[PDB]
Tab-separated table of C-alpha atoms in Angstrom:
chain	number	residue	atom	x	y	z
A	1	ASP	CA	13.985	9.152	-20.108
A	2	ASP	CA	15.291	5.601	-20.464
A	3	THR	CA	14.869	5.118	-16.721
A	4	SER	CA	11.401	6.683	-16.764
A	5	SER	CA	10.097	4.598	-19.660
A	6	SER	CA	11.338	1.509	-17.831
A	7	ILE	CA	9.645	2.532	-14.588
A	8	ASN	CA	6.405	3.130	-16.490
A	9	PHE	CA	6.417	-0.235	-18.215
A	10	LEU	CA	6.978	-2.064	-14.931
A	11	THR	CA	4.127	-0.227	-13.224
A	12	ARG	CA	1.925	-1.827	-15.888
A	13	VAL	CA	2.453	-5.153	-14.107
A	14	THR	CA	-0.066	-5.514	-11.304
A	15	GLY	CA	1.708	-5.647	-7.966
A	16	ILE	CA	4.678	-3.569	-9.099
A	17	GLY	CA	4.452	-0.188	-7.401
A	18	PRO	CA	6.591	2.862	-8.283
A	19	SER	CA	9.171	2.247	-5.544
A	20	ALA	CA	9.353	-1.460	-6.324
A	21	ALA	CA	9.691	-0.606	-10.012
A	22	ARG	CA	12.621	1.761	-9.464
A	23	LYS	CA	14.365	-0.787	-7.260
A	24	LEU	CA	13.915	-3.303	-10.071
A	25	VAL	CA	15.180	-1.049	-12.852
A	26	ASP	CA	17.925	-0.046	-10.450
A	27	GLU	CA	18.900	-3.717	-10.598
A	28	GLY	CA	18.947	-4.016	-14.379
A	29	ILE	CA	15.479	-5.336	-15.208
A	30	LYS	CA	13.530	-3.138	-17.603
A	31	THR	CA	11.791	-5.271	-20.232
A	32	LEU	CA	9.156	-7.992	-20.073
A	33	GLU	CA	11.983	-10.404	-20.902
A	34	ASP	CA	14.099	-9.217	-17.983
A	35	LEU	CA	11.119	-9.676	-15.682
A	36	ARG	CA	10.295	-13.091	-17.095
A	37	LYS	CA	13.915	-14.141	-16.553
A	38	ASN	CA	13.829	-12.866	-12.978
A	39	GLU	CA	10.705	-14.142	-11.248
A	40	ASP	CA	12.877	-14.842	-8.206
A	41	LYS	CA	13.005	-11.070	-7.713
A	42	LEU	CA	9.215	-10.644	-7.528
A	43	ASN	CA	6.757	-11.396	-4.725
A	44	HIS	CA	3.809	-13.711	-5.422
A	45	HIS	CA	1.430	-10.917	-6.470
A	46	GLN	CA	3.911	-9.370	-8.909
A	47	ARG	CA	4.798	-12.783	-10.392
A	48	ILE	CA	1.155	-13.604	-11.167
A	49	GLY	CA	0.769	-10.118	-12.594
A	50	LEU	CA	3.668	-10.902	-14.925
A	51	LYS	CA	2.224	-14.280	-15.864
A	52	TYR	CA	-0.953	-12.631	-17.104
A	53	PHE	CA	0.608	-9.333	-18.184
A	54	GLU	CA	-0.954	-9.322	-21.645
A	55	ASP	CA	-4.340	-10.717	-20.607
A	56	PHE	CA	-4.604	-8.075	-17.880
A	57	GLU	CA	-4.307	-5.316	-20.492
A	58	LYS	CA	-7.358	-6.630	-22.335
A	59	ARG	CA	-10.866	-5.262	-21.796
A	60	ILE	CA	-13.745	-7.516	-20.757
A	61	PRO	CA	-16.866	-7.586	-22.995
A	62	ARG	CA	-20.160	-7.197	-21.126
A	63	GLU	CA	-21.302	-10.521	-22.547
A	64	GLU	CA	-18.418	-12.208	-20.725
A	65	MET	CA	-18.988	-10.222	-17.543
A	66	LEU	CA	-22.552	-11.567	-17.560
A	67	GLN	CA	-21.330	-15.164	-17.842
A	68	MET	CA	-18.810	-14.506	-15.078
A	69	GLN	CA	-21.584	-13.041	-12.930
A	70	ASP	CA	-23.763	-16.139	-13.351
A	71	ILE	CA	-20.942	-18.418	-12.295
A	72	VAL	CA	-20.219	-16.357	-9.195
A	73	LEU	CA	-23.823	-15.852	-8.130
A	74	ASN	CA	-24.746	-19.480	-8.774
A	75	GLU	CA	-21.869	-21.015	-6.822
A	76	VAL	CA	-22.463	-18.646	-3.930
A	77	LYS	CA	-26.172	-19.494	-3.765
A	78	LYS	CA	-25.345	-23.207	-3.556
A	79	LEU	CA	-23.012	-22.726	-0.601
A	80	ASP	CA	-25.748	-20.874	1.322
A	81	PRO	CA	-28.786	-18.955	-0.062
A	82	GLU	CA	-28.374	-16.398	2.753
A	83	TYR	CA	-25.173	-15.154	1.101
A	84	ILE	CA	-25.659	-11.939	-0.854
A	85	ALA	CA	-23.318	-11.238	-3.761
A	86	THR	CA	-23.313	-8.173	-5.999
A	87	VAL	CA	-21.093	-7.448	-8.993
A	88	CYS	CA	-20.494	-3.705	-8.879
A	89	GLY	CA	-18.245	-1.348	-10.845
A	90	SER	CA	-19.201	0.227	-14.178
A	91	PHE	CA	-20.664	-3.153	-15.101
A	92	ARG	CA	-23.522	-2.665	-12.656
A	93	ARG	CA	-24.172	0.682	-14.335
A	94	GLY	CA	-24.624	-1.122	-17.647
A	95	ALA	CA	-21.128	-0.604	-19.110
A	96	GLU	CA	-20.450	-2.430	-22.389
A	97	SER	CA	-16.981	-3.441	-21.166
A	98	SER	CA	-15.074	-3.705	-17.893
A	99	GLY	CA	-11.445	-3.894	-16.808
A	100	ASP	CA	-12.045	-6.345	-13.956
A	101	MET	CA	-14.762	-7.925	-11.844
A	102	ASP	CA	-15.504	-6.415	-8.446
A	103	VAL	CA	-17.758	-8.515	-6.218
A	104	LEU	CA	-19.321	-7.312	-2.954
A	105	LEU	CA	-20.185	-10.159	-0.591
A	106	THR	CA	-22.059	-10.323	2.717
A	107	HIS	CA	-23.965	-12.704	4.997
A	108	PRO	CA	-26.430	-11.940	7.802
A	109	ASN	CA	-24.130	-13.880	10.178
A	110	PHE	CA	-21.468	-11.207	9.744
A	111	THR	CA	-22.238	-7.753	11.178
A	112	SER	CA	-19.989	-4.817	12.090
A	113	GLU	CA	-20.134	-5.757	15.766
A	114	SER	CA	-18.779	-9.158	14.791
A	115	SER	CA	-15.195	-10.360	14.950
A	116	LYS	CA	-13.452	-11.685	11.826
A	117	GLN	CA	-15.059	-14.545	9.901
A	118	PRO	CA	-12.480	-15.177	7.131
A	119	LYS	CA	-14.035	-18.501	6.120
A	120	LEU	CA	-17.170	-16.610	5.108
A	121	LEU	CA	-15.049	-15.284	2.249
A	122	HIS	CA	-12.586	-18.143	1.816
A	123	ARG	CA	-15.375	-20.689	1.506
A	124	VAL	CA	-16.588	-18.815	-1.562
A	125	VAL	CA	-13.071	-18.443	-2.959
A	126	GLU	CA	-12.377	-22.147	-2.494
A	127	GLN	CA	-15.579	-23.215	-4.225
A	128	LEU	CA	-14.884	-20.967	-7.209
A	129	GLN	CA	-11.446	-22.535	-7.421
A	130	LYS	CA	-13.015	-25.978	-7.224
A	131	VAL	CA	-15.206	-25.282	-10.257
A	132	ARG	CA	-12.043	-23.938	-11.904
A	133	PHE	CA	-13.295	-20.363	-12.330
A	134	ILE	CA	-10.737	-18.787	-9.985
A	135	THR	CA	-7.277	-19.770	-11.258
A	136	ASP	CA	-4.833	-17.831	-9.091
A	137	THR	CA	-4.594	-15.719	-5.957
A	138	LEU	CA	-2.734	-12.409	-5.930
A	139	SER	CA	-3.458	-12.011	-2.223
A	140	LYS	CA	-6.139	-12.631	0.391
A	141	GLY	CA	-6.949	-11.315	3.834
A	142	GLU	CA	-9.798	-11.677	6.302
A	143	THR	CA	-12.198	-9.540	4.278
A	144	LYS	CA	-10.749	-9.140	0.799
A	145	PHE	CA	-9.611	-11.440	-1.995
A	146	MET	CA	-7.677	-10.344	-5.075
A	147	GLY	CA	-7.144	-12.980	-7.712
A	148	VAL	CA	-7.491	-14.300	-11.227
A	149	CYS	CA	-10.412	-16.031	-12.912
A	150	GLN	CA	-11.220	-17.434	-16.329
A	151	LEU	CA	-14.291	-18.518	-18.273
A	152	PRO	CA	-14.174	-22.191	-19.328
A	153	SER	CA	-13.852	-23.177	-22.993
A	154	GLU	CA	-9.261	-19.621	-25.106
A	155	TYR	CA	-10.626	-16.860	-22.825
A	156	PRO	CA	-8.228	-14.273	-21.387
A	157	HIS	CA	-7.547	-14.493	-17.647
A	158	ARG	CA	-9.303	-11.698	-15.749
A	159	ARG	CA	-8.736	-9.756	-12.551
A	160	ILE	CA	-11.324	-10.363	-9.870
A	161	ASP	CA	-11.778	-8.958	-6.390
A	162	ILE	CA	-14.194	-10.206	-3.763
A	163	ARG	CA	-14.797	-8.061	-0.693
A	164	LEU	CA	-16.606	-9.346	2.375
A	165	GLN	CA	-18.637	-6.556	3.983
A	166	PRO	CA	-20.715	-6.612	7.216
A	167	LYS	CA	-24.434	-7.006	6.465
A	168	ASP	CA	-25.306	-3.743	8.232
A	169	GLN	CA	-22.831	-1.855	6.018
A	170	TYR	CA	-23.400	-3.854	2.811
A	171	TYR	CA	-25.576	-1.483	0.779
A	172	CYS	CA	-23.450	1.557	1.547
A	173	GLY	CA	-20.674	-0.584	0.118
A	174	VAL	CA	-22.617	-1.608	-2.981
A	175	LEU	CA	-23.510	2.052	-3.557
A	176	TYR	CA	-19.906	3.185	-3.200
A	177	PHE	CA	-18.394	0.453	-5.369
A	178	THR	CA	-20.999	0.946	-8.087
A	179	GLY	CA	-20.030	4.610	-8.501
A	180	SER	CA	-19.310	6.369	-10.621
A	181	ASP	CA	-16.761	8.531	-8.788
A	182	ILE	CA	-18.575	11.644	-9.972
A	183	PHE	CA	-21.907	10.324	-8.761
A	184	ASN	CA	-20.502	9.338	-5.368
A	185	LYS	CA	-19.063	12.851	-5.023
A	186	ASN	CA	-22.359	14.450	-6.002
A	187	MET	CA	-24.384	12.198	-3.728
A	188	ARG	CA	-22.177	12.774	-0.699
A	189	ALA	CA	-22.330	16.518	-1.343
A	190	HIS	CA	-26.136	16.437	-1.415
A	191	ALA	CA	-26.200	14.216	1.683
A	192	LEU	CA	-24.282	16.967	3.451
A	193	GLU	CA	-26.750	19.647	2.411
A	194	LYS	CA	-29.391	17.385	3.933
A	195	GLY	CA	-27.582	16.881	7.237
A	196	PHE	CA	-26.082	13.471	6.495
A	197	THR	CA	-22.611	12.146	5.819
A	198	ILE	CA	-22.071	9.070	3.680
A	199	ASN	CA	-19.036	6.853	3.215
A	200	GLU	CA	-18.525	3.289	1.979
A	201	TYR	CA	-19.725	1.855	5.305
A	202	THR	CA	-22.512	3.985	6.715
A	203	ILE	CA	-24.735	7.019	6.505
A	204	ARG	CA	-24.911	9.099	9.665
A	205	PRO	CA	-26.803	12.237	10.710
A	206	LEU	CA	-24.696	15.403	10.910
A	207	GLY	CA	-25.318	17.534	13.982
A	208	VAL	CA	-25.040	21.309	13.607
A	209	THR	CA	-21.897	20.567	15.625
A	210	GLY	CA	-20.384	19.019	12.520
A	211	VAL	CA	-19.854	15.754	14.379
A	212	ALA	CA	-21.559	12.743	12.803
A	213	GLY	CA	-23.947	10.768	14.969
A	214	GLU	CA	-24.534	7.021	15.086
A	215	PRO	CA	-24.890	4.945	11.873
A	216	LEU	CA	-28.452	4.765	10.531
A	217	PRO	CA	-30.276	1.535	9.566
A	218	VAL	CA	-29.734	0.581	5.926
A	219	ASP	CA	-31.291	-2.535	4.386
A	220	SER	CA	-31.052	-1.530	0.721
A	221	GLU	CA	-29.617	1.192	-1.501
A	222	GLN	CA	-33.105	2.675	-1.614
A	223	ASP	CA	-32.934	3.496	2.103
A	224	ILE	CA	-29.874	5.709	1.517
A	225	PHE	CA	-31.621	7.752	-1.176
A	226	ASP	CA	-34.657	7.938	1.140
A	227	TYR	CA	-32.633	9.504	3.964
A	228	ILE	CA	-31.355	12.285	1.721
A	229	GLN	CA	-34.693	12.743	-0.032
A	230	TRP	CA	-33.422	11.881	-3.494
A	231	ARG	CA	-35.609	9.732	-5.704
A	232	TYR	CA	-33.915	6.385	-6.301
A	233	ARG	CA	-31.186	6.591	-8.906
A	234	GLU	CA	-30.906	3.509	-11.105
A	235	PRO	CA	-27.299	2.374	-11.426
A	236	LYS	CA	-27.608	3.056	-15.155
A	237	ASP	CA	-28.235	6.720	-14.328
A	238	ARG	CA	-25.249	7.120	-12.013
A	239	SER	CA	-22.656	8.348	-14.516
A	240	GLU	CA	-22.770	11.506	-12.404
């Protein structure tokens, strides 16, 4: 019990997985105090998770999400109008509150046949840091950024992810990350009944063989619904 309750509290800190949590409790750190007195035992991601432990357990009001959206979309547009940025998650479905901000980013210069273009993403991250919206980085790779942001003022720090997706796979991504999970499940099931398979990257025909063919052209979410003969489903109507 004691061990379990300690392992559960730790897992509430972003970055601290189950294994990492056990190893930590196994070393004598169980409380928030212990953690805060032992940052030297945590990697960068876990340490930032600890720093904003409380803030990260707070919900985000839609009104704030909207202000966050404006900041993101506006800065991106200034860097290059060709950039396309979409805030997904339950927020895109009209949710009155969110737990984090998930942003899908693309640029016509970056397609799936293209090699890595990390600066496409990092340029955006750097600018948002410049305007002081992004305050910390949990981690960042060639196509994904996980960090912390804050509205200027008192405002809680919020979790934000920015994913760079190839232009030719962008809308399948926006669809997937908009959800909900139930809706995605139901849409993929229907796609199958129609001879198509859909994932977060593409929609492909499904030969009677069961083996998916080449990816089909997608230039909007609408195209995906069109392929499977479903009338367009507004994000607000995608609870399931």
